[PDB]
Design a protein around this nucleic acid. Structure first.
Length: 96
DNA sequence: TCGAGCCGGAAGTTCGA
DNA sequence: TCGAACTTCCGGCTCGA
């Protein structure tokens, strides 16, 4: 249930691109047991990023990273038109 | 009445060409 | 060698039960 490293298998061919990784993990395995992926147009909410949130901080050899970070670094990520957060709730994320 | 998560700004080091 | 890129630290705002 972690086909990320198996799907990616994308080697140390340079650090991955932030959103490309997140976007690759998005349209990936089930995502029903650890998060919520609607089966309609393109809506993505983070229900329980327990494995995602700790993988995010693990890549940096950092043991634990709360989710506030993503609301932090992901927010400042409005540099390119790639992932915009939804003004609906707070754990609702979206991509263009 | 009380706690929790989200956001605002800046600085610092490294990548590919 | 050049410029941009993503990360992390400090402290502050408001909502629901």
């Amino acid at each position: 249930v972690i086909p990320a490293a198996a799907l990616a298998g994308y080697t140390g061919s340079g650090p991955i691109q932030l959103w490309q990784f997140l976007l690759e993990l998005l349209t990936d395995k089930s995502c029903q047991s650890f998060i919520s992926w609607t089966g309609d147009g393109w809506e993505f909410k983070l229900s329980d990023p327990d494995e995602v949130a700790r993988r995010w901080g693990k890549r940096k050899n950092k043991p634990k990273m709360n989710y506030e970070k993503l609301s932090r670094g992901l927010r400042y990520y409005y540099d390119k038109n790639i992932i915009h957060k939804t003004a609906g709730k707070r754990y609702v994320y979206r991509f263009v």
